[PDB]
RNA sequence: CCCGGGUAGUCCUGGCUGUAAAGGAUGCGGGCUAGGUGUCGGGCGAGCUUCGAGCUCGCCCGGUGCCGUAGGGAAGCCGUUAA
RNA sequence: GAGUGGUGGCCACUAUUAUUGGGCCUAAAGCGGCCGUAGCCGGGCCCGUAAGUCCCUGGCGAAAUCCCACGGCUCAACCGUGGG
């Protein structure tokens, strides 16, 4: 029995050295001039956590998860991400 | 039957097979004999060779492979290819012919023709690896693995050898047009086979 | 000794396939066998079967089409619910939908598609694919 | 296989698929009753009546034959002698078992050193008890009933 | 004593016969120095 | 091997020599089969096949 | 798309870079037959979909 | 079409040696799909050249192992080279080759050319439980795969999932086409010749599996090249 | 190590010890997955016979060896006597 | 990057704990061999009960913590309102 602990909102690369990783991480550091690569590492654990609700409502039956794909559509849709008519695909 | 005589089909002795059996010609075996030796169905062996006369009618003449390690299957099947067109290659078979192309005789046939599977096997290996119908001359003792067409026929003889090609040539023949009627063949039987 | 006719006859299926045969002959007999031929023929794995008496449990004969990737028993018989599916077509099947988990249910013995239809659950008796 | 000896042998009765009995057997089901009960009056074990029918009065199997008294079953030996009263107090099988087993302890009794006939005794009681255990819970014999060789001696004689 | 096959192979070893036979020696003068 | 085994042996309507009686008896008796009136041999057993000594009528199924 | 030749005896599609041969049917000759790399080595036979001749 | 006039030059270029090259040559084949499955054997590398082209780019030639080779003779140690190498086009079209010489130039040549050689086919799909989707972005089903004491089963994966395996099976599978699929090994994967050979053989039993004529729809399969 | 002698032992009758590269370095029962060819016991059919419980060929079941297809394995090799 | 290094501990790495899912001829490992008690696994068909099993429906399994949507602190961390 262990109380609450705040968690991190980005997560590291598996591994802090490969060479194509590196490359691509520093073309979009210098096209997006972001101040390090933590602002980007949360970005990319955002969009990995939206496709992960995708993948995991896409294989779902039930009424919470239709209430659910809705929800995740509109949010999206809300936030600009996609267009008005746009499919949880 | 029809093509030649029973007389003188069991004269070339095409119905004697060998003391050993596969199950594969349990089909093409007749009957046993008392010492052992297994005899095969002329029936089978004539409608085989016309079957086989008019597959390979079809095909263009410089295309078909001929070959037999056998010294006693080496002549025939020399004429047989000189009548027909169709290559020979009597002896020892040089591998790589048909799968190294730096090979000074390097050739790409359409069909092969072996008197034996197990004397062929080189020949056969070859032409299963370039992918090309495989017909084969088949004794009671021959395996039909990667044999497309069979014909069964005692492949170990002379006279029987030399009137299953001189049968077959003359079937190609007179399939493709080159000959009017089967009557009309002049070259005789016992030239096919060798002396002694 | 004998225990699993269901598990010999599928895997007798699975040999005689993946060697070439056009033709099975399954011995023992018995309803269970029956019945899941019946639902791979339904389904389009296997060709006509047949029944044959001897006296005795009797014996199948099946023609094989040359369909089946693989087939089997499923020990031991786990039951499973409606909702519970997904786990067990990961197990036994290669992608989504693509084979079939023969499931015995209280409405007799079905795909588990048709059990998801019916939204009844049951115990897993054999898959193929 | 083999309990003991673990080989595989395939041999036994070709029993042919039949459903009722031939046609040109020229005994009815009484007859063949009282065959089986003047045979068993001689003194033939179950199998050895079969066996006789078989052979000498052309009855391929009193198994074919549907019980007059009871439409739900077959006809057989033990039924029929069971009907009239003659049916063994202890199974054939087991009696026999028994015999041979208290015969073999009489010859190791004057032959201590053979040890496999020994060994071979052992594997005959091993067969005696399973066979019992299955009497026993199928209610044949009674629930005290046990194995002894001191008693066999005396169930054989 | 328990069997290990992989000692039986001399590569860069003594015959394990005589390294047995001198293990016994070795847990007998113990036995008799304890006075058993 | 064979999928549905059936019997080598056969039932033979037998004509005894030396009564005339008519009897039914089996091909691979293993015992000695005797007439059901004169008591004479008509079968003997063997290891296999048993030999018959009296008049073949009739193969039966 | 295009169409992926299929064994005259087993059915099964045959792939890319396998012992596979075709040829048309040696008695009539019109429908061509197609014979698997396994089902040549085991000799399996086959039968013409026009004739119903068989065998190797 | 710069690919285009490199086939064309080389056409012009070639003659042929073998059946199947006379064939290409005098326009009897004109499409890469129609020299497989059919029992032939490409032993002249022009047929690729010509009928696929683009394996030629530096960038759909991948080299993924060099070995340095000694055996021993009395008068010291000979050196080999062997260059195993991967080639193909991003479409459905793969080939691996290995090559030996005396310096690494030779071994990659040779290693090209066995690799263009042995270029294959394979299928494309979707089949994955989370995705459901008809593109040809991953294998359309679980596959397996083995060689030596490697085994490598590849199972579907969702799009936008990259390549969830090895360095070198990635890079084959982005050679072939495949950019989404999850990876499970067993055996010695450190050996780059075994575990390279083994997602080849696993991208190439994508053709010997049976499938009904509506699992075509289901899983958008496609055969080789697609709708490019 | 080689050569002449030699005690215990090796042998028998009652016991104890329970150990081996005690190895097929492979636990046991069951269903299925091409063949070929040796040999032992039994049964079936045919032909010979000097009429022999004799000889030869074919078939079925159960033993005991070798080669080998599919396939398996790191390979050696195993492969209906499976590893 | 206001963090970055060193040491110990746990999980993955490790299908080196293997129900999913490991091995035992030659690398670790088949008891020298067999008989058999508990346990585990057990031929075919029919009828009956429903203990296991599956489906539906009431009473429960505190809150906080976990996921989703909206709203309030500038957004967020945090908190509130609903669903799970
Ligand atoms: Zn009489
Ligand atoms: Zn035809
Ligand atoms: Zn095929
Ligand atoms: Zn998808």
Request: aromatic share 8%.
């Amino acid at each position: 029995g262990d109380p609450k602990r705040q968690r991190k909102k980005y997560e590291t690369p598996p591994h802090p050295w490969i060479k194509e990783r590196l490359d691509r991480e520093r073309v979009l550091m210098d096209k997006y001039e972001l101040k390090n690569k933590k602002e980007l590492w949360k970005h990319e654990t955002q969009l990995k956590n939206f496709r992960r609700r995708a993948r995991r409502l896409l294989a779902a039956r039930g009424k919470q998860a239709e209430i659910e794909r809705e929800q995740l559509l509109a949010r999206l849709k809300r936030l600009g991400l996609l267009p008005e008519d746009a499919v949880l695909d | 039957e029809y093509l030649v005589p029973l007389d003188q089909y069991l004269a070339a002795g095409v119905h004697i097979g060998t003391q050993q059996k596969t199950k594969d010609m349990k089909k093409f075996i007749y009957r046993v004999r008392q010492d052992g030796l297994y005899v095969l169905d002329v029936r089978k062996t004539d409608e085989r060779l016309k079957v086989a006369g008019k597959f390979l009618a079809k095909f263009e003449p410089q295309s078909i492979l001929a070959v037999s390690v056998r010294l006693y299957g080496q002549k025939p099947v020399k004429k047989f290819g000189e009548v027909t067109g169709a290559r020979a290659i009597p002896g020892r078979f040089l591998p790589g012919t048909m799968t190294n192309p730096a090979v000074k005789n390097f050739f790409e046939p359409d069909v092969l023709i072996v008197t034996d599977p197990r004397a062929d096997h080189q020949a056969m290996r070859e032409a299963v690896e370039i992918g090309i119908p495989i017909v084969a001359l088949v004794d009671t003792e021959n395996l039909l693995s990667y044999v497309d067409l069979a014909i069964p026929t005692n492949n170990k003889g002379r006279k029987a050898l030399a009137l299953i090609y001189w049968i077959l040539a003359r079937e190609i023949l007179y399939n493709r047009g080159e000959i009017q009627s089967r009557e009309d063949f002049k070259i005789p039987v016992e030239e096919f086979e060798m002396k002694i | 000794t004998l225990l699993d006719p269901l598990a010999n006859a599928l895997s007798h299926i699975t040999n005689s396939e993946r060697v070439g045969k056009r033709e099975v002959y399954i011995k023992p007999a018995s309803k269970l066998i029956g019945e899941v031929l019946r639902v791979m023929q339904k389904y389009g794995y296997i060709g006509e079967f047949e029944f044959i008496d001897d006296g005795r449990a009797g014996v199948y004969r099946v023609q094989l089409l040359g369909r089946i990737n693989k087939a089997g028993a499923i020990k031991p018989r786990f039951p499973v619910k409606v909702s519970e599916f997904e786990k067990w077509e990961k197990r036994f099947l290669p992608a989504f939908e693509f084979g079939i988990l023969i499931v015995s249910t209280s409405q007799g013995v079905m795909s588990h598609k048709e059990a998801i239809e019916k939204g009844i659950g049951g115990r897993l008796i054999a898959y193929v694919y | 296989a083999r309990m003991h000896a673990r080989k595989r042998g395939k041999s036994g009765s070709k029993r042919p698929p039949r459903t009722a009995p031939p046609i040109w057997v020229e005994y009815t089901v009484e007859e063949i009753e009282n065959l089986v009960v003047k045979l068993r009056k001689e003194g033939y074990s179950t199998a050895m009546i079969g066996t006789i029918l078989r052979d000498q009065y052309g009855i391929p199997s009193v198994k074919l034959f549907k019980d007059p008294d009871n439409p739900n079953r077959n006809l057989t030996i033990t039924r029929i002698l069971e009907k009239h009263g003659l049916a063994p107090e202890i199974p054939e099988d087991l009696m026999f078992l028994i015999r041979r087993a208290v015969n073999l302890r009489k010859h190791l009794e004057q032959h201590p050193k053979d040890l496999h006939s020994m060994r071979g005794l052992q594997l005959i009681e091993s067969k005696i008890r399973r066979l019992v255990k299955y009497y026993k819970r199928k209610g044949k014999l009674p629930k005290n009933w046990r194995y002894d060789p001191e008693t066999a001696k005396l169930l054989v004689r | 004593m328990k069997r290990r096959p992989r000692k039986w192979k001399k590569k860069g070893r003594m015959r394990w016969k005589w390294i047995k036979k001198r293990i016994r020696r070795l847990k007998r003068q113990r036995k008799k120095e304890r006075g058993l | 091997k064979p999928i549905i085994p059936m019997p080598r042996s056969r039932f033979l309507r037998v004509k005894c020599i030396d009564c005339g009686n008519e009897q039914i008896v089996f091909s691979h008796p293993a015992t000695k089969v005797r007439c059901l009136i004169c008591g004479a041999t008509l079968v003997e057993p063997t290891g296999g096949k048993g030999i018959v000594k009296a008049k073949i009528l009739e193969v039966l199924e | 798309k295009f169409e992926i030749p299929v064994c005259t005896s087993c059915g099964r599609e045959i792939t890319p870079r396998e012992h596979a041969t075709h040829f048309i049917c040696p008695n009539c000759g019109e429908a061509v037959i197609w014979r698997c790399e396994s089902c040549r080595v085991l000799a399996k036979p086959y039968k013409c979909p026009n004739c119903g001749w068989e065998g190797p | 079409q710069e690919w285009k006039e490199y086939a064309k030059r080389v056409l012009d270029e070639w003659e042929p040696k073998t059946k199947l090259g006379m064939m290409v040559k005098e326009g009897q084949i004109t499409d890469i799909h129609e020299i497989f499955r059919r029992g032939y054997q490409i032993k002249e590398p022009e047929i690729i050249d010509v009928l696929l082209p683009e394996v030629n780019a530096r960038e759909n030639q991948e080299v993924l192992d060099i070995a340095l080779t000694v055996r021993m003779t009395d008068s010291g140690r000979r050196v080999r080279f062997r260059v195993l190498a991967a080639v193909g086009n991003r479409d459905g079209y793969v080939g691996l080759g290995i090559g030996h010489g005396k310096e690494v130039g030779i071994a990659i040549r040779k290693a090209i050319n066995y690799a263009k050689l042995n270029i294959i086919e394979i299928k494309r799909g979707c089949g994955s439980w989370e995705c459901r989707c008809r593109r040809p972005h991953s294998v359309p089903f679980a596959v397996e795969g083995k060689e030596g004491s490697v085994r490598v089963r590849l199972i579907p994966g969702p799009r936008g999932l990259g390549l969830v395996i090895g360095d070198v099976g990635k890079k084959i599978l982005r050679l072939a086409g495949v950019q989404d699929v999850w990876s499970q090994t067993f055996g010695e994967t450190r050996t780059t010749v075994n575990f390279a050979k083994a997602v080849f053989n696993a991208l190439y039993n994508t053709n010997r599996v049976a499938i009904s004529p509506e699992m075509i729809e289901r899983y958008g399969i496609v055969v080789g090249r697609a709708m490019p």
